[PDB]
DNA sequence: AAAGCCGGAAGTGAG
DNA sequence: TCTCACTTCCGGCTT
C-alpha cells in the first residue's frame, strides 16, 4: 500500500516537512498543488527505489489517475489537483 | 519557438 | 510464473 502513489501523495499532504513540494489549497475540498514538480519526482522515484523517474514521466501517472477517477485536474491554477475520493474509498 | 500538458499503447519491476 | 500499478515512448494539442 505504501508503494500506491495515492497513498505516498496523502503521507507527504499530511508531513509540513513537504510544504515546498506539495501542499493543500483547500483542505476541506481535497484541493492541493504541487509546488516542486522536478524535486517531488525525485522524491516518487526514490521512494519506490527507481531510477530516471521523471516528472513527465510522474504525471503521467497522474493522468492514470484521471482515468480511475482518483483525482481530477482542477483549474484555479496551474499544477492543482483534487482527489474525488477519500483513502478509505480508494481502497473500497 | 519552446515548454507543458494530454491520452493511446506498449513495456515492466515487484508482490 | 502472472498480474497490477504504474512506467516508457510519443504524436498531438495547449500555454
Redesign the pocket.
Known sequence: DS????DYVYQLLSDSRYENFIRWEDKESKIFRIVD?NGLARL??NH?????????????????Y??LNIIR?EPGQ??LFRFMKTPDEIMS
Open positions: 508503494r500506491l502513489l495515492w514538480p516518487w522515484g519506490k527505489n527507481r531510477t530516471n523517474m521523471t516528472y513527465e514521466k510522474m504525471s503521467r501517472a497522474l493522468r492514470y484521471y482515468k485536474k496551474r499544477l
